[PDB]
Symmetry: D2
Subunit: 257 residues, 4 copies
């Protein structure tokens, strides 16, 4: 295959969950930049519509619908609509929508636990199940989970969050092996702290920000496009022998003494 | 500290969940063998009572009550009874009770997912929360989770099982760091296939057994005491600088090419 | 930075050791395909000339000289010539040239050990030292080591080979943290078996080929461009927050049960 | 096998390199405490004699000779003498003697590199080869390498040191799989900073001490017996299903955020 085709997503179809802000928004734009047709969602109709209008103004081929991926019935309805829009063929599934709670282990409620498991683990698992027929039908499938680099280390307050992301890292391995025969690859990107609306209150908390940045060799938090570029690469034919991997995008955070 | 005291559990108190069969039964006996007073549980009153009678006949200091650790209210009642019996001081918590479903990713139901999360992950998490005061009050605490070596590799059918155990491996790291200041250590033992009542149908399935054993350098499945010995060691003062680790007891399975 | 610029190597200079065959040849072509000017080397003057003539006919900008990177004095001469050719500014260092011996542990000689350490570990370490000023001067330096996926698992015959690659994987982490202050990133690519006629490698005979085919979920060995693409990506501005990582390119080999 | 027998080293013979100070001295004492007969060595005849006299007064069975394990011919002479003393039957090989240099990457000399590879990697590899017949003859052989927790993270100054320990960690896996057929198990213990007056090590000065104290959740460096206990355990019948593992003994250092 030519270098040009190996580094392109021209003609492909993609579903990115949680695409109106932060990393997901950057992933939508990165995939469109390499020629993908993209479907996205969020929980907020007004914000999603504005995003879709902005993208249509820019001639970006993006469509979408409101979906709370923590709801089983909404996931079912999303997968049905995505299959209808893309005529049953999906090249790319990016499980980006997630959730976060920061508390000491002693403080987590049953509701905190169920919230994090549903949005970080069950959502991705069930969406993978639902998308398997159209990923297989595309003939070339790529699943990317957005995990977290803290699923390899212990950050104060992150116990249940990191545990659900560690579950995602293992699921990545099972998906990669079980669905290889369908020409579907599965990988996880594990970011460090990234500048997004989800981390705006963290950036305002200078004591917390400075402590985290002091552990990053690069001396700064990441930017959304520093995650999105790798997400696009992992979907390209260039990545055809990369499957089952968890790749940290963290400026050296996890390996820093 | 003397070698004798560093390799002893004399005077300690311990809670082992799921102690009537398999690995948990071997852990109860190993801890008692080093002088621990042990509390255990299972879901089956008749089998638990027979175990407790057998142990009393042998002069093993073991008590227990019926508890389904997948139930929030039963966990609360267990922790209250354990605290009452041990006068508020618990040296050792072994989270051994778990559950297992083997299906292709495509086949898992919502109920399979919720079953495995509740019994493998939420049970251990909540019991750790409930036991934290008495672990702290003991002055020297040790938590051991029984994970699985398949939380590092992809075994067909193990997707949700391995993912919940991978969550346990990460939780091990968070517990180890957050509660170090309370002199509590937390580690995980990750067995390969072990000969237990839980694997009896697997051993009858010679095609499945032979395939798994062909991947084990040692050419056999493990025995329960090969897990229980390490569980006892990790609770001894000898293990005072070991915390946050996931140790595979698998005959070389996970590292075998 | 625009998408086009983040995914470009225009204006960069690169040193790739061992570019005359196998993975290294594909890495040279991939870098030139994104606009890099490349310097390469090998021990075989005739093969090096033939490669350089072919790239000149293709209008690629590739330079080279004969160098045995297992020799300290030849590495010093190589680094001085590269610095002269590129006016003391080097964006990219790819340590690709390696050595391979396949024997049981009992069979390795002192010379096998010295051979493997010199070319797989010492050469990369010393070349990094020698290239540090040029890499620092570029302002966006990228070091890529080519390791092996077998630095995480045990493959028959691979003991010393895999051990030197495990050393490279750790060196990657030290380089990433010590030289982050110069905006030099260091990462390792760990291939599985790659189709490489003319190099002694992973696929030593039909038994090794059949073994790898059976253990890779995709049921095939990799192609050189499947490693080279990731090498190019890791050098692009798109990879600006990725450092200290060991990324397996092995079709799922190491994580497959 | 009874509990008492599974936790005993009665009737075993052991070779521990570098038993005159630091961790190795504690390992000798721990092995003798469980009934092992031990052979040890060092380069300092006066220190070796003083240690051997002290153990004789304590009625421990320890033998030794002067040996520089960085020398191929001296390793051959050591293995021949050990085989003579133990009549060709060795239960335990502990590769403890090491070397340590702390410099920035830019500062390492060719001699530093050769020094560290010879004692941390080549010595252990060649001693394993030389001891294989005696270990096989025992029927229950156990090899323990002493690695370092910094083979998983980047500590300032540790580049070549950590890299040689990363090589040891991989060699552990190859030995575990290749020699499982002889019932020889191989594992690595990876300590964090251990209080070791009289050896050049992790704690090079007050800045290193303060750093490690700040990064260890337990807020302290380790003690030699905290490594030695695990070394003894890994040699006991209790550890019969544990092989190919790298176990960190670091108070949580490597996994602490
Ligand atoms: N930022 C970091 O530092 C960081 C670090 C590591 C990992 N991550 C992971 O990166 C992923 C994205 O994080 P981010 O920081 O970019 O988050 P963010 O800025 O909060 O943006 C999240 C996006 O997802 C949508 N979303 C949230 N919950 C949803 C649900 N239940 N259903 C559908 N959409 C939902 C949000 O829109 P609505 O709220 O309108 O639905 C929004 O579009 C998450 O999985 C996160 O855990 C982030
Ligand atoms: N055996 C293996 O190959 C293997 C491998 C890797 C990991 N593991 C892990 O090892 C642990 C023990 O496994 P095992 O093979 O020894 O299992 P096992 O033979 O089935 O025995 C399980 C014990 O736990 C009790 N138990 C089960 N569910 C329970 C619940 N909800 N509440 C309280 N007790 C419960 C059982 O009694 P009742 O049913 O009467 O309650 C029994 O006493 C599990 O966490 C398992 O996932 C096992
Ligand atoms: N299946 C695989 O091929 C495989 C799998 C995993 C990892 N890897 C790793 O990937 C890298 C490339 O592997 P490869 O198989 O393509 O080839 P290789 O045999 O490692 O390297 C061959 C290239 O390097 C040159 N070379 C070798 N030794 C040299 C020396 N001392 N000085 C200068 N140049 C030298 C060769 O040319 P001359 O011989 O003419 O000098 C040739 O251009 C290596 O690090 C290898 O260990 C390969
Ligand atoms: N904080 C720590 O101390 C630390 C942390 C992590 C890992 N480790 C590892 O743990 C092991 C023990 O470390 P350590 O600090 O206690 O001591 P060390 O300096 O590695 O070893 C000292 C012992 O080995 C002997 N020795 C050294 N080089 C030798 C050679 N070439 N031939 C024969 N004997 C030799 C010494 O006696 P002579 O000098 O008299 O020969 C002494 O008995 C080493 O592998 C070390 O790398 C240590
Ligand atoms: O979502 C919030 C968040 C904050 C800090 C983090 C992080 C996520 O991952 C590594 O450090
Ligand atoms: O519980 C059942 C079970 C069966 C096979 C396994 C396993 C667990 O862990 C590694 O292989």
């Amino acid at each position: 295959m030519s270098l040009e085709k190996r580094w392109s997503l021209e003609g492909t179809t993609a579903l990115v969950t949680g695409g109106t802000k932060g990393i997901g928004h950057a992933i939508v734009e990165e995939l469109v930049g390499f020629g993908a047709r993209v479907y996205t969602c969020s929980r907020n109709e007004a914000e999603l519509r504005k995003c879709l209008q902005e993208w249509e103004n820019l001639k970006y081929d993006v469509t979408g619908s409101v979906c709370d991926v923590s709801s089983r019935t909404e996931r079912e309805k999303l997968a049905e609509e995505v299959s209808s829009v893309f005529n049953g063929k999906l090249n790319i599934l990016i499980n980006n929508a997630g959730g976060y709670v920061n508390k000491p282990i002693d403080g987590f409620t049953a509701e905190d636990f169920s919230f994090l498991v549903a949005v970080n683990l069950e959502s991705a698992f069930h969406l993978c199940q639902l998308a398997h027929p159209m990923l297989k039908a595309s003939g070339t499938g790529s699943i990317v989970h957005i995990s977290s680099c803290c699923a390899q280390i212990a950050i104060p307050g992150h116990s249940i969050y990191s545990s659900t992301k560690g579950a995602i890292n293992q699921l990545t391995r099972n998906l990669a092996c079980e669905w290889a025969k369908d020409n579907i690859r599965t990988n996880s990107i594990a970011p460090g702290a990234i500048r997004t609306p989800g981390t705006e209150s963290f950036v305002i908390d200078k004591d917390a920000l400075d402590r985290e940045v002091s552990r990053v060799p690069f001396g700064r938090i990441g930017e959304p496009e520093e995650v999105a570029s790798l997400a696009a690469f992992l979907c390209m034919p260039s990545a055809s022998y990369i499957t089952g991997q968890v790749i940290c995008v963290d400026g050296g955070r996890t390996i820093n003494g």
